[PDB]
Design a binder for these strands. Sequence first.
DNA 1: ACAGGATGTATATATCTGACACGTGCCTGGAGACTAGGGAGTAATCCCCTTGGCGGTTAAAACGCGGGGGACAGCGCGTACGTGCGTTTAAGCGGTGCTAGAGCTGTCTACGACCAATTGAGCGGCCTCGGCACCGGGATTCTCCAG
DNA 2: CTGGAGAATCCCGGTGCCGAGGCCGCTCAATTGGTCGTAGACAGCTCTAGCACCGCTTAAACGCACGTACGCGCTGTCCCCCGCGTTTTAACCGCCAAGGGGATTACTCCCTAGTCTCCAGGCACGTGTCAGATATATACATCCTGT
Lengths: 79, 79, 94, 94, 98, 97, 109, 111, 76, 298
Amino acid sequence: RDNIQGITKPAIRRLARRGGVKRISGLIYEETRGVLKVFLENVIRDAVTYTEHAKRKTVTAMDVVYALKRQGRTLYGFG
Amino acid sequence: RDNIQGITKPAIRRLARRGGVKRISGLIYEETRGVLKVFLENVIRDAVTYTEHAKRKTVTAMDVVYALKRQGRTLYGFG
Amino acid sequence: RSRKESYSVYVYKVLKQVHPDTGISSKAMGIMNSFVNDIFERIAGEASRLAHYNKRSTITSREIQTAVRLLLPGELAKHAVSEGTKAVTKYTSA
Amino acid sequence: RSRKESYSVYVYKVLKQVHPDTGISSKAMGIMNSFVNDIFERIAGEASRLAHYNKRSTITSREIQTAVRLLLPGELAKHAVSEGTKAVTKYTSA
Amino acid sequence: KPHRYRPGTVALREIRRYQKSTELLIRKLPFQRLVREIAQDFKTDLRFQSSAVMALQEACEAYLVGLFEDTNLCAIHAKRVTIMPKDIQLARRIRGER
Amino acid sequence: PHRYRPGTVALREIRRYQKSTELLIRKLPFQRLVREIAQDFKTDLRFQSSAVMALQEACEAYLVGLFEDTNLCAIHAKRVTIMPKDIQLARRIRGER
Amino acid sequence: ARAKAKTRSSRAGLQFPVGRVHRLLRKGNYSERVGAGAPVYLAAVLEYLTAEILELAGNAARDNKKTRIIPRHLQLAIRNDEELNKLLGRVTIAQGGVLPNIQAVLLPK
Amino acid sequence: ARAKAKTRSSRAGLQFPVGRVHRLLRKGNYSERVGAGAPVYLAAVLEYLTAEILELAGNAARDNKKTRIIPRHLQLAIRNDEELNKLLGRVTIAQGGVLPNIQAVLLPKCT
Amino acid sequence: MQIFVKTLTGKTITLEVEPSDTIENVKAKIQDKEGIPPDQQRLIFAGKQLEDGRTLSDYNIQKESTLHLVLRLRGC
Amino acid sequence: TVKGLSNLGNTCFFNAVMQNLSQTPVLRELLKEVKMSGTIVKIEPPLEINLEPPGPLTLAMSQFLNEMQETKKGVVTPKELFSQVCKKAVRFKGYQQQDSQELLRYLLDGMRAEEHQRVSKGILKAFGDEELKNKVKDYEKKKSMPSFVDRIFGGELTSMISLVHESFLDLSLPVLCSIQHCLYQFTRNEKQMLISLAPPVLTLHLKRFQQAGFNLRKVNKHIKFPEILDLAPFCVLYSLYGVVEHSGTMRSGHYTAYAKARTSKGQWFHISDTHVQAVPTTKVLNSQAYLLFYERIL
DNA sequence: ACAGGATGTATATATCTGACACGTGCCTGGAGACTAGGGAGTAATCCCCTTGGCGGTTAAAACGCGGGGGACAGCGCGTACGTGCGTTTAAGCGGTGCTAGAGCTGTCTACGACCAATTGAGCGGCCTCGGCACCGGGATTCTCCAG
DNA sequence: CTGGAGAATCCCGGTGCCGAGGCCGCTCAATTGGTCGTAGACAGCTCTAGCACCGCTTAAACGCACGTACGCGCTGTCCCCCGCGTTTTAACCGCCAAGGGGATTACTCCCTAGTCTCCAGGCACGTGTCAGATATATACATCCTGT
C-alpha cells in the first residue's frame, strides 16, 4: 500500500498548472488523490472483467481503451 | 412568429421552484428562454430528420423519443 | 390490424407474485415496458460487442453474465448473476 | 504470423493529395486509424439502428445519409452529404 | 391592518407544493406554437402528434428542472441564495453543453 | 537579492505545461498504485506497458479536465484560489456523485 | 401425441418468456447464432430487475397510502435507491416529479 | 480474359477502399444485407472527414513550422475548430496536451 | 496582365501576372525582386486581406491595379 | 460617458480599436437599421427577398455600443466580440500578439461580408443549383453593393496613368515632417493617386515600421498633426476625434487610445485598457500617434 | 514611466541518429460473370387523426406598489502559500537472465440453425367493479405579530 | 424569548366516474423432432513479453524560512425582487367538420446474395535518407528594484 502517497504534491501541482490553476490550497492534495483513486476502481474493474471474460491472465491495452470507451472516455493512440 | 414570449414569467418561476430555488433574479427569464430554444433546436432537428427519413411529414412521438434517446436523454412512458 | 407486443402480462404476473394485492396503472405499464426494453437492448448490445471483441460468433451465457457485471453495479450485479446462474442450472437440470 | 488490417495506406494517400510535401508520425497514423474506426462504427451503428427503426432489412445510401445528418451537424453534414451524393452518382454512372 | 407573510415563507410553501405534484408547468397552446415555429425552420408545414408534443413538453420540463437544480447548487456555492445568470453559464459549461 | 513576487512563476509554469505534452505523473509510483488497486479485484494479474501508459494518459486527461472545471468554479466564486468545495461541486454537476 | 409442451420459462421456473427473448435476440441483429442459455439468463436478469423495481414501487405506494403503482411511485422508488439511481441516472420518467429536497442554507435561521 | 478489373474506389473516384468497407459492413454484423451504394457513400464521408482533419493538421504544423504531423498538431487542429471539437468532444488523444489559455482574472494588471 | 505593387517605403513597382496565378505565386514574384520572406508578407487589395490559397481572378483584380504591402507589428 | 475596457491579457490593441470606434456616432444609428427590420428588397432580373437577421459578427458588435452608454459601470468586458472574431481568423485564437491595423481590416470587411453573404444567401435559400449559387456570387462580386461600412469608412481612390477606379477603406501613409507632409508623399506623379469619393469618416495609418536592409526597426520619429485637415487639394475639412498611440517596438509594444467625448472642442480622455485619464489636447498632439480618425464636418 | 541587471527563452549551426518513404515477394480478398430469390418500390384504398374553427369561463398572466433583505463595494487582518535553497531518494536506464502464458495449429464433437407439423398463449375486444378525483367540512400546523 | 389569529394544508366522509381486472375468440409464434455442418472446446508447441533485479546519476521530491497577497469577517447601502390587490386576456374545454396523410394489400422486378474463378491490390520485410533531438553560443524579452 501507501503508493497513493506516491502521487506527489509537485505532481498534483503541475497537473493543476496544466489545467490552468493559479494557486492551490493545501487541502486539495488529499482530495485529488481520492477522486483519482475512485476513477481507478471505476476503470480497472471493467478492465479486469474484460480480461476475465477473455480467459486471459494479463490486462491488455485493448481492454483498457475499450473499458474507457464504454464509459464515454474514448481514447485515441492505442488501437 | 414571436412564440418564445409565450413562455411566461410565472411558468419560469414554477419550473424553478420545482427545481427548488428560493429567489430568482429578473435576468434569469430571457436566458431560460434562450436555453429552451437551443434545446428545441437540438431535439427537433433530429426529430424532423427521423420523420423525413421515413418519407412521411407527420411527426410521431416515437421519433421524438428516439431523438431524445440518441442525445443521452432517454425518456420513458411513450413506447 | 397489426399486433403489437409488450411485456405487460409478464410484469403483471411478477407484480402479483411480489405484492398479491397491488394494482398497476396503464401509464406505469408503458414505463415498465420501456424500462424492460432499454435493459434488454443494453445487455444484448454489450453481449454482441464482447462477442466481437473475442473474435467470437456465438452469444452464450458467459458474455451475458459479463454484460450484467458490466452494467449492473455491486449488490444488484451479484444478485442478478446469482439469479441467472440459478435459472441456467435449473434449465440444464430440466 | 497473423495478418493485420488498417487504413494507413489510404490515410497516407489522402495526406499526399491534400498536402503534397508533408509527413506524418507513426503515432499520428495510429490516432487517425482509431478515429476512422470510431467514425465508421458510429455511422454503421446509426444506419443499422435506422434500419431496425423503420422495420427495414437493408442498409442503403439513404440510411447512411440520415446517419450522417444525425451525427455530423451543420457544415460538416452539409458538405458530407454532397460528397456522398456525388460519389454515388459517379459510381452509378460508371 | 393587512396580513403579510415574510418574504420567503410562501416561496418555500409553493416550492413544497410544486415538488410534491406532477402536473405540467408550461401552457400547452403556447408550447405547441413555439414548437411549430421552431420546426418551420427545418421542414415546411409539418404536422405534429399530440403524444409527440407531450413528449417534447416532458423532456423540456425535465431538462429545465435539472438545470435549475444545478444552478441553485452553484449559487449556494457562491455563498448566496439568489440565482443570477452567470450561474447558468457555469452550470451549462461544467455539464459540457458549452 | 533577486526574488520573483508570487504569481509570476505560477503563470510561467501554466504557460509552459500548457505547451508540453509529456507525462506529469511518475510512471513507477503510478504503476504501483494501479497494481495495488487491481489487487482486490483478482490476484496476481499482469499488465502491459501499453496498458499502463493508456491508463496514465486517461487519468491525467481526466484530472486536467476536472482542474479546468474547478478553476472555472472558483472564478465563479469570485476567488483566485481553488478549494475542495469547488471539486465536489464540479463532480456533482458532472453527475459523478 | 409426442409429449405435453412445457415452455422454457416453466422449465427454468420463470414468469418472463424465454422463447420470446430468444426470438428478439435472433431477430435483433446481434449475432448469427445464440447459445441456449443466453435467453434464460437474460430473462432471469430482467425478472429480477423488475422484481425489485416493483417491490420498491409497492413500498413507496404503501407509504403514501395508495393501492396502485403510478409513475410518481416509480420515480420515488428509482431515485431513493442509490444502486438504481446509478443504473438509471440518465433516464427521464414522465409524470414522475422530483424528490423533495431543500438545501439547509435556504432554510430560515 | 474477361475485363480489366477496375476497383470500385476508382469507379467512384475515391481514395478510400470500397470493397474493404463493404466487407466490414457485411462481416461486422450490422445488417443481414447491404445495399450497393452504401459502402461507396460511407467511404466518401470517411474520405471527406479525414481530408478535413489532415488539412487542419497540416495548417497547424505549418503554423508551427514542422514538416511532420504529430499528435499535438492533431489535437490543435481538432480543438481550434469548434465544429470538430463538438464532433469529438468526448475524445482524449495521447500526447495531445491542452490548448494554451489562461483566464483573464488570473492575468496581472498592467500600466 | 500588369499590376503595380507598393512596398513598405511606398515606392511603386510594376509586376506582371496572369489571372490563373495564385497568391503563392504573387508573393513568390515578390521574393525575386524584393527578397522579403513570405511569412510576414501581406498584401491589401481594395481594403481586403488576400487569402493565400485563393486566386487573383476571384478577387476581380484588373490591369493597372495597386497592392498595399505592410508588415505585422507585435505589441502588448 | 467614457469607460474602461477589461484587457484579456494581450488585447490592448483590440481594446484600443474598440474605444476609438466607440466614438463614432453615425455607426450607432446604422446598426439599428441593420438588426430590424428584415425588409423585403426587390431586384428586377438583370426578386423580392426579405432581409435575414444580422449575423453574430455584426450582432455582438451592435450590442457592444449599447453597454458603452447604458451600463453604469466604468469597466466593460469585450469577451464576446473577440471570441466572435476567434472563429473568423484562426490567427487570433490564443494569446499570441497581434496588431491594431490588421485587426481592423478583417473587422471592417467582416461587417460587409455578412451583409455580402446573408443577402446573397437569402435569394438562394428562397429560390432553393450550385452553378446558380456561383452566378449569384459572380454577379455580386462585380457589383458595388452599398454596405454600411462603405457608407461610413468606404472611399474611392482614382489612379491616373488611363484612369482606374479602386475602392478603399483606409490609407497607409509611407514614412520617410507632418501628417500632411505624408499626405503629399502619397500623391506624387510617377502615376498620381487621387480620391474622388471622400468617406464620411477617414481612417489614416502611418508606416512607422520599416526594414533597414535586414534590420527591422520601428520609426519612433514623432509626427505633427492638427485637429483639422483640408482634403480638397487631395481630392473638405475633417475634425480629429480618434487617435491610436503605440508605445514600444515591432516585437514589444503597448497600444494606447485617445478619444473625443462629445455630444466647443471637448474632451480628450486618455485610455489605458481599464485606466481612464483626462488629458489636454496639447498632450494629445504630443502623443506618438499611430492611427488617425477624422470626422466629416463640411 | 524609465534604466539596468538577472534570468529565462527562441534561434542558428553542427552532428548524430533513428523513423520513414521506397523496393520486393507473396498471398487472399476483391472483382467479374452467372444464377436464383425475395424485399421494397408503386398504386390504390380505407379510415384515424390532425387541423381548424367557434364560443363561453375563469383562472392565470400583467401591472403596480411598498418594503425589506441581501449583493456588492469597501476596509482590515491574519494566515498560508508561493518562492527560494540545501539535503536526500528513488525514478530511470541499461543490462542481464528467466519463464508464463498468449497465440497458433490440428482434432473432434456437441450444438444451434433449419425444416415440417402441432398447438396454446398472448392479443384484441368486450364487459364489470373498485380505485380515485372531486367537493365539502373539521382537525393540524406554521407563521407572524405584539409584549 | 411566548401566546392567539389567521390562513394554508391535510385527513376524513359521501358521491359519481372510468380505468384496471376478468372473461371470451383466435391466430400467430412457440414447441417438438430429426438432421447436418460448423464453431467452439481442448491439448500441445513456441517464443514474446512481462517479471525481477542490480548498480549508477541526478533531477525531482522534501523540509524549512518568510512575507506578502489573498480569503474571510464586519459594515453600510440602496436597489432589486418578493408579496399582494386589480384587471385583463387567452388557455382550456367541449364540439363539430373536413380531409389529408398514415397503414395495408397485390404485383412485380430489380437489386442483392451466393458460387466459382482469376489476379491484382495490400501487407511484412530490408534499406538508405532526411526530419528531429541534442549541445551550445548567442540576441532578445520580461520582470524586479531603484528613482
